[PDB]
Amino acid sequence: SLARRPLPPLP
Amino acid sequence: VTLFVALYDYEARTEDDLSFHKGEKFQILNSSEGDWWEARSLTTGETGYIPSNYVAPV
Ligand code: NA
Numbered sequence: 001s002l003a004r005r006p007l008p009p010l011p
Numbered sequence: 012v013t014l015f016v017a018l019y020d021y022e023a024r025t026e027d028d029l030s031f032h033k034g035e036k037f038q039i040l041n042s043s044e045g046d047w048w049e050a051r052s053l054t055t056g057e058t059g060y061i062p063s064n065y066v067a068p069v
Contacts, residue, residue: 002027003045007064011019 013039015050015066029059036069037061 015037023030029052031037040058041049047060 001044002025002060003041003047003049005045005047007046007062008021010064 012068014069015039016069017061017066019065021062021065023059027060029057029061031061031065037066 017031017033017035017037020032021030028047029037029050031052031054036053037050038053039048039050042063046063048063048066049058050061050066051058
C-alpha cells in the first residue's frame with residue numbers, strides 16, 4: 001500500500 | 012494538529028504523490044496507515060500522498 005512505502009531521504 | 016507545512020521541496024515519483032515546494036501548506040486527511048499521509052495541498056487543492064518526514068505542524 002501507498003502509505004507504507006519507505007520515506008525519501010532528506011535533502 | 013492537522014495543518015502542516017513543507018520543510019523542503021519534493022518532486023513526486025508516482026502518480027499518487029503530490030509535488031510541493033518549501034513552505035507550502037497542507038491539510039492532512041489520513042495519517043493512520045503509514046508514514047506517507049494522504050493530504051490536500053492548500054495551493055492547488057489537489058489530494059495525494061506526501062512523505063511525513065518532509066512536513067511539520069504549523
Ligand atoms: Na514530519
